[PDB]
């Protein structure tokens, strides 16, 4: 599935300098709604921009007044850019994405571990390790003795690993009594039935 | 700025001096692929992803070319206004829960990077380690700065201590985020 790209327009006419240009495609409710914006940045400062909702290039700063005017004057350029809403955004979504990103699913690897040695009747800490999963949206809960609990529980927010796999950790503040068995429960679209890990105290 | 998904189909970055460029594609925040400006070839993060879709490198090459041009133009339009450096902040963690002996991966997440030129090396007991290291591209940040990730494959053992050594111009001296299996 050949993917398409946005085309930067030509600018009109020891210290470091950084330039950056990007084509941002915003898909609200799948392809149903699409907002397209291109940003031209020179030293962390956005100076010109094309907002799908404005229909043309606009100067965000005075440093971008030249470029904006010239690109809007030349019909060829303006239409080229404008059309990218379909030729790039819609095309990639309905094509490469739908058959690659939008349809990739990775199942988590849950495992329960306890901080300090099992000290019966002595407060300790239990942690649920949900790792390696995609997409993002996921839920986690702690099952003590058949009863879910919220108090004394905390989970680090989504930890993006960078390799298209996410991660999250949930700590349980309890006390390992005798007999009772703890179990972590997590809901993730990468699976039909909530995966549940158990730990006999 | 709200939406269910956001694809950045075309991210071109160009620096001067040094004549440094980067061209990538991003989706929901992860990197789909990047064009190797030297090898003139596309490189997908997920090799499997490269099996399903495709992208002509020239698309990135032409852009970089345009970006390089405009950089020269804007540098003048603002009479050589230089870029103010930043102090990058690192963070280290394992890809999965650590279990002594069981091979894992150490991740260093460096953020607030600007300009996009940094050295990120790993240290094993204060010793420079090479093999087993994979570095990503520069990801884009809303404030137009950048962020990068580096990965190291190791064998969990209390017998060793690690630290991510970050070297950047915005730092008075190299910094290192220490991390141990303790």
């Amino acid at each position, epitope marked *: 599935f*050949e993917a398409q790209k946005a*085309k930067a327009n*030509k600018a009109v006419d020891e210290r470091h300098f950084v330039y950056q240009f990007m084509g941002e495609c915003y898909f609200t409710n799948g392809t149903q709604r699409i907002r397209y914006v291109t940003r031209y940045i020179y030293n962390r400062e956005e100076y010109v921009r094309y907002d799908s909702d404005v229909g043309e290039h606009r100067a965000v700063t005075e440093l971008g007044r030249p470029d904006a005017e010239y690109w809007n004057s030349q019909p060829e350029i303006l*239409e*080229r850019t404008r059309a990218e809403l379909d030729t790039v955004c819609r095309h990639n979504y309905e094509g490469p994405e739908t058959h690659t990103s939008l349809r990739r699913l990775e199942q988590p690897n849950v495992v329960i571990s306890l901080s300090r040695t099992e000290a019966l009747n002595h407060h300790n800490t239990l942690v649920c390790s949900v790792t390696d999963f995609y997409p993002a949206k996921i839920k986690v809960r702690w099952f003590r003795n058949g009863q879910e609990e919220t108090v004394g529980v905390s989970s680090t927010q989504l930890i993006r690993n960078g390799d298209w796999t996410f991660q999250v950790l949930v700590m349980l503040e309890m006390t390992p009594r005798r007999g009772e068995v703890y179990t972590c429960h997590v809901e993730h679209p990468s699976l039909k039935s909530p995966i549940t890990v158990e730990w006999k105290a | 700025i709200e939406a269910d998904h956001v694809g950045t189909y075309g991210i071109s970055v160009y620096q001067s001096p040094g004549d440094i460029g980067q061209y990538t594609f991003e989706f929901d925040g992860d990197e789909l692929f990047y064009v190797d400006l030297d090898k003139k070839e596309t490189v997908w993060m997920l090799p499997e992803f490269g099996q399903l879709a495709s992208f002509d490198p*020239q*698309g990135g090459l032409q852009n970089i*070319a345009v970006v390089k041009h405009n950089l020269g133009v804007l540098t003048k339009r603002s009479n050589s206004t230089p870029a103010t450096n930043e102090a990058p902040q690192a963070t280290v963690f394992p890809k999965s829960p650590v279990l002594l002996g069981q091979p894992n991966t150490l991740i260093c997440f460096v953020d607030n990077i600007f300009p996009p030129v940094i050295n990120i090396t790993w240290l094993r007991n204060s010793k420079s380690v090479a093999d087993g290291v994979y570095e990503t591209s520069f990801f884009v940040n809303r404030d137009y700065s950048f962020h990068k990730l580096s990965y190291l494959t190791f064998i969990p053992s209390d017998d060793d201590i690690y630290d991510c050594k970050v070297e950047h111009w915005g730092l008075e001296e190299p910094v290192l985020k220490h991390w141990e299996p303790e």
Partner: T-cell receptor, first 111, second 109 residues
């Protein structure tokens, strides 16, 4: 505008030819096409700017060089008969959606 | 991305109807061009069309960007003897323009 030197030249097989091209109009991209019969125009090498050179559809046997911005030249080392034909250089702006050719160049690579 | 001029060579009497056929095939959204090359000189631009479905015309010629037929045929109503030359069809949905084989037009007085 754009001009090619030499306009025409003969060369012995195994030789070494160097086609030069120099355009006035500040164009970033430059191309080297080869005209024949039954193939019309075919791209050999192009360039997005100084220091740049990209492979066209038929790059085999040729080398390209973009030293300056206004100068792009095609280079044939071990020339062969199969490389005998007409060569048209072209300059144009980004994304090559607007290109201007030169007068042409007749090349004869005899056995 | 590839062009296809089925027209090997065309010859017709002055003030006739010229119709050179061209069919492309891309994976993108190419711009279509027509180049006229008069014997002796290099090829020059006649007309082009970036946006799909709509026609471009110049000095008596005109061609339509038909997506349904992936075609870009060249038309002329009163072909003068001056219009005798080689006509090239080209398309570019990337960084460089690819050309078709070519079609030679001989307009007899």
């Amino acid at each position: 505008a754009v001009t090619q030197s030499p306009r025409n030249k003969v060369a012995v097989t195994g030789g070494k030819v160097t086609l030069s091209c120099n355009q006035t109009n500040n164009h970033n991209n430059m191309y080297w096409y080869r005209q024949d019969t039954g193939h019309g125009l075919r791209l050999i090498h192009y360039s997005y700017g100084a220091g740049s050179t990209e492979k066209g559809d038929i790059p085999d046997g040729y080398k390209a060089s973009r030293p300056s911005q206004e100068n792009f030249s095609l280079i044939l080392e071990l020339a062969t008969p199969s490389q005998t034909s007409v060569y048209f250089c072209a300059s144009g702006d980004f994304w090559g959606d607007t290109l201007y050719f030169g007068a042409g160049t007749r090349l004869s690579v005899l056995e | 991305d590839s062009v296809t001029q089925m027209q090997g060579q065309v010859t017709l009497s002055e003030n006739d109807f010229l119709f050179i056929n061209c069919t492309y095939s891309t994976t993108g959204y190419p711009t279509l061009f027509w180049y006229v090359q008069y014997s002796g000189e290099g090829p020059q631009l006649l007309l082009q069309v970036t946006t799909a479905n709509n026609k471009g015309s110049s000095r008596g010629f005109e061609a339509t960007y038909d997506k349904g037929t992936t075609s870009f045929h060249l038309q002329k109503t009163s072909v003068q003897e001056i219009d005798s030359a080689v006509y090239y069809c080209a398309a570019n949905s990337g960084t460089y323009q690819r050309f078709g084989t070519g079609t030679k037009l001989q307009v007899v007085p």
